C-alpha cells in the first residue's frame, strides 16, 4: 500500500456535500487540513494552483518507476555501464528531503540545522563513530550549496535511489578502486559530483528531451490519480474568489494532463454539463519557472493555444478570456488579478520552488500539499506507543538508539519524512516555518466552510512562559 | 530605571556558592537561564566569549546618550544644519531590532516574516490604512538587503532614535520640501538613503576615528557595569574547559576595558591574590571580524602586546602562552583549542554576528545574553492581566487593537523588544531559532551547577498532535 493508493481511495469516493457528514469527514487525520499559521478562509480573494504532485498526482511506485528506469537508459546510453539495466526502482529506500553529499558520495538525512540524523554510502548505513572521519562535528553547512544538494520533490525520488544504487554498484564492482571522492578505473576518475551531475542532467533530459511525457500521457489511468471532485471544489472556488493556475510545465503537456484529471461524463457535480478544464481558472500561466517566477521572472509571452506555440514577443495586452500566458512573473498575477500577497492561497508541492519562495518574496498565504501524508499518518498512529515509548525514556541510552531505529524502519530504511525519532528533518522544520496550511491532499479545503478560521495557537518564548 | 540598572544591582552582590541559595536564586526569572533547545552543561569542553555587551555591558542610558552626542557632532562637523546641536537622546523611543526602510524613510517594526508590527516616520506613527500607500500588503522582502537594513545591537540604538530626529527635522522645517524618498532644499536632492549612509558612516566613525573610545575609558565607572563575580565565574569556567575570547574590538581598547572588569583587590574569591585578565583565557583573539570570522575570515596575525601593534606577516606557529591572535577565523579557534563545534559554547549579545552566523556556519553552541530582558521581564510580570487579558479576546477587534496598544507602550515608544500584542517580532523569532540559551546576563551560569542540562521539551508538528 502506497501513499497513492490511499489517495486514490479517496478520490473514488463522491463528495457528501451535507454541513454534517462534511464536518464529521474532516475528524479523520487523513482528510484534515494542518494548521502551522491562523488563517481566515475569507480573506483570500484567489487560490492559486500548481500542477505538477498538486491536481496532478503521480502514482505510486508506478511513475517513480518509470522515471528511474528511462534516467537509467539515459545514462548507459551515454556510457554508463550496461549493469545498470539490472537495477530496478525500490520504493522502500528512498526519503523525501535528503542531501545529496557530492564530496563523499552520501545520502544524508539532516535536521533543520544541519545536524545528521542518518548517513548512507550507497546502501550502507553509517552509525555513531564511522561517520564522524567524514562529519567530525556530525553537521553540515547548508550554505555550501556547491557541494550539498537537498531532494526536495517527489520528481527526486527516482534520482535519491538511483545515486544509492551506482554508489553501491561501483564500490562492489572490482573495476573500480574506491577513493575518498569518488572512483577510479584504470586512468578515469569518475568523482561523486560528476556521477552526480550527470544523474541530475539524464533526470532532467527524460524530463524534458526524453519519453518521460509521451510515456506517461499514453496511459495516464496508469499513471494519474484522477478525482470527480477537484472540478467541484474548484467550482466551488470559483464562486467566493478568483483562481488560477501557475505551472513550470508547458502548455501542450499541462493541456492533456489537465484534459484527462477533468475528464467526467458531468461537470462540478454529476448531472451537469461537462466544461472544458480551462474555464475553471481566471488566470492559467505555463513554464512558469518557478522560483525565478517569486523574483524578476522572465518576460510575459502568450500562449497560442492551437499551435501550442508561444507568439512571437512580449505580451503587452491584458486578462481576456481564453488567454494563456508563460513566463512572466508572481506580481504579473497580482497585478492581472487586482491581488495583495495575503489575498492569495498558494497552493503546492514544492517546499522551496513553490511555499518557501512565494512566502518571504511576496508574503503569500501558503497551503503545502503532501502526498506521503495519507501513508505516514497511518504509521504516527498504529506506532504511536514506540513513540510515546521513545518519549517516556527521554524523560527517564542505548535503548534510545535501538527504538529510534525500529521506529523509523516503519517508514523505510531512510526513515520517516518528518523525523528520525525525537529529532524533526529540515523538510519538517520548514513546512512548519513556510506552510501556513498542509494536508495529504487540496482536496481536504472542501471538507471545511467557506469563511472558516484555521487556528494556530499562539506561541510563547521561554521567558514568556 | 534601566536595564543597566537591574544589571548593575545583581552585580552590586556577592556570590553565595551555598548549593541551597543557588538554586533558590535561578528561581528568579532575572537569574534564570533561558533554554530553546536542550543543552547538557557537561559535552561544552570550550566556553567562548565576545566583550562589548557582552562582557563589557555598557551603562545605559549614558553610553547610548554619549554615542549619540558624537555621531551627532560628527554630522554636523561634515555639514548637517546646527539645529542638530539641539537633540538630545530619549531612551522611551528606540526598541532594538528595528528595520531602517532606506526607500521611504520609516522605521518598521517587523515579525519573522516581513509582516508589519509598526510603522514610523520620524515621530509619527503610520497606523492601519494610511501605511497600506507604502507597504500595499503590509509586508517587507527581507532580501532586499540594499533598502533594508536591520538595526540588530545595542551599538545602534543612538542611530535609532537619530534616524527618528533627522526624518522629524527635515520634515517639519520650511527649508525642505518633503518627497516620497526623500526631501529637497533647493537644487540639493537628500535621499533617505544617503541620509542613512552618511548617519552609518558617521556612527562608525566615531567608534574608529572619534572620541567615544577615549571618552569611555576616561569614565569607566560611569560608562561600564562592574561584576566581582565575572571572575569567580571565569575561573569556574576554566576548571572543566577552555576559555576564549574572540572580539571585534582592537587590542588596546579590549585590554583598557578587560583590565578595568577584573579590577577588585582579590581574584575569584575575596581574599585571593589578583590576576590580570589575561590569565582567565586560554586563546585571546581580537579584531575578529565577525561574522566574516566564521566563514573564510581573515589571515591569523599575532599581536605584539607591548606595543599593541601586529606583528607583520601571517602567523604560523603554535597556541603558546602570553600570544595574542588577530583576525584568523573559528577555524583557527576549533584547530587550537582542539574542539568540535557542539564542544564550544559561544556567549554572545549579537543575534546575527555572534549567534546566527557560529550556529550555521558552524553548529557551535550558542548562549544569547540580552541585557533589556532585566526590564522586559519586570513589565511581562507586572502587565500580564493586559496580556492575560488580549489573549482572552482572540478566543471570545477594535478593543484588541487598543488593547495591544498600551500593552506595548509600557515598553516605549517602538514597544517590547519581543513583540507587538500577540505577534512576535523577527528578533524573538531568531532568538527562538538560534540562541541554544539567553539570558539578561551570562552570569547567570553560575547559578547551575557544572554539569546541568538544560531541558527544552521536544516539538511536535499540528498532524503530530
Ligand atoms: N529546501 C531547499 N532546497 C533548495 N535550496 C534551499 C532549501 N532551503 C534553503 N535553500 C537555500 O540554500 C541556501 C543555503 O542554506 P541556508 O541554511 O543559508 O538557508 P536558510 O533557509 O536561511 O536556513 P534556515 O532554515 O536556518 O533559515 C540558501 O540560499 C537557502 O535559501
Ligand atoms: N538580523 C539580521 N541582521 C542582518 N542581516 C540578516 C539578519 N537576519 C538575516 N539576515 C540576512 O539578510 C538576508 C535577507 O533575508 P532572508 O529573509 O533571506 O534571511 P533568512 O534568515 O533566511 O530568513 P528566515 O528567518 O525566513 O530564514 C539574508 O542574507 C540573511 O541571512
Ligand atoms: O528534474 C526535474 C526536471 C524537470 N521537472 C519538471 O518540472 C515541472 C513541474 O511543474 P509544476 O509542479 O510547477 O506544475 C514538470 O513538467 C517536470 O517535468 C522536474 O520537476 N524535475
Ligand atoms: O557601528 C558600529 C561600529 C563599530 N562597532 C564596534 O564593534 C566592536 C564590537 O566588539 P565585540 O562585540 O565583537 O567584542 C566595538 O569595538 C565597536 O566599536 C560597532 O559595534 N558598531
Ligand atoms: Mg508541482
Ligand atoms: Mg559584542
Not at 555550501?144 to 564492482?173: H, K, Q
Not at 556521477?195 to 489511468?221: C, I, P
Request: proline content about 4%; aromatic content about 14%; overall charge neutral.
Amino acid at each position: 500500500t502506497s501513499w497513492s493508493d490511499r489517495l486514490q481511495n479517496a478520490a473514488d469516493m463522491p463528495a457528501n456535500m451535507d454541513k454534517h457528514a462534511l464536518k464529521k469527514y474532516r475528524r479523520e487525520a487523513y482528510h484534515r487540513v494542518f494548521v502551522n499559521r491562523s488563517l481566515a478562509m475569507e480573506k483570500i480573494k484567489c487560490f492559486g494552483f500548481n500542477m505538477d504532485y498538486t491536481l496532478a498526482v503521480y502514482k505510486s511506485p508506478e511513475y517513480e518507476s518509470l522515471g528511474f528506469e528511462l534516467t537509467v537508459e539515459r545514462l548507459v546510453s551515454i556510457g554508463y555501464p550496461q549493469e545498470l539495466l539490472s537495477f530496478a526502482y525500490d520504493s522502500t529506500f528512498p526519503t523525501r528531503g535528503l542531501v545529496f553529499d557530492t564530496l563523499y558520495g552520501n545520502l544524508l538525512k539532516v535536521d533543520a540545522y544541519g545536524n545528521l540524523l542518518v548517513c548512507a554510502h550507497g546502501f550502507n548505513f553509517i552509525r555513531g563513530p564511522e561517520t564522524r572521519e567524514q562529519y567530525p562535528n556530525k553537521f553540515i553547512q547548508r550554505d555550501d550549496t556547491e557541494r550539498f544538494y537537498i531532494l526536495n520533490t517527489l520528481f527526486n525520488l527516482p534520482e535519491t535511489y538511483l545515486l544509492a544504487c551506482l554508489v553501491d554498484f561501483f564500490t562492489n564492482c572490482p573495476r573500480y578502486t574506491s577513493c575518498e571522492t569518488g572512483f577510479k578505473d584504470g586512468d578515469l576518475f569518475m568523482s561523486y559530483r560528476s556521477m552526480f551531475q550527470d544523474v541530475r542532467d539524464a533526470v532532467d533530459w527524460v524530463h524534458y528531451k526524453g519519453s518521460l511525457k509521451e510515456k506517461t500521457v499514453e496511459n495516464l489511468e496508469k499513471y494519474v490519480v484522477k478525482d470527480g471532485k477537484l472540478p467541484l471544489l474548484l467550482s466551488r472556488m470559483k464562486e467566493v474568489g478568483k483562481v488560477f493556475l501557475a505551472t513550470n510545465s508547458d502548455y501542450k503537456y499541462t493541456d492533456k494532463i489537465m484534459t484527462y484529471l477533468f475528464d467526467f461524463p458531468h461537470g462540478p457535480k454529476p448531472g451537469s454539463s461537462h466544461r472544458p478544464w480551462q474555464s475553471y481558472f481566471d488566470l492559467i500561466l505555463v513554464d512558469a519557472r518557478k522560483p525565478l517566477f517569486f523574483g524578476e521572472g522572465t518576460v510575459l509571452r502568450q500562449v497560442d493555444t492551437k499551435t501550442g506555440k508561444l507568439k512571437i514577443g512580449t505580451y503587452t495586452g491584458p486578462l481576456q478570456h481564453g488567454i494563456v500566458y508563460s513566463g512572466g512573473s508572481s506580481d504579473t498575477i497580482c497585478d492581472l488579478l487586482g491581488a495583495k500577497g495575503k489575498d492569495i492561497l498558494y497552493i503546492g508541492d514544492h517546499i522551496f520552488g513553490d511555499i518557501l519562495k512565494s512566502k518571504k518574496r511576496q508574503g503569500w498565504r501558503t497551503f503545502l500539499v503532501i502526498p506521503e501524508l495519507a501513508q505516514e499518518l497511518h504509521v504516527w498512529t498504529d506506532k504511536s506507543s514506540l513513540f510515546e515509548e521513545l518519549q517516556s525514556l527521554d524523560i527517564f541510552q542505548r535503548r534510545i538508539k535501538k527504538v529510534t531505529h525500529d521506529m523509523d524502519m516503519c517508514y523505510g530504511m531512510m526513515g520517516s519524512l518528518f523525523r528520525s525519532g525525537s529529532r524533526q528533518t529540515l523538510f519538517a522544520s520548514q513546512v512548519m516555518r513556510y506552510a501556513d496550511l498542509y494536508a495529504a491532499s487540496f482536496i481536504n479545503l472542501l471538507y471545511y466552510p467557506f469563511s472558516y478560521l484555521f487556528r494556530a495557537a499562539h506561541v510563547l518564548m521561554p521567558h514568556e512562559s
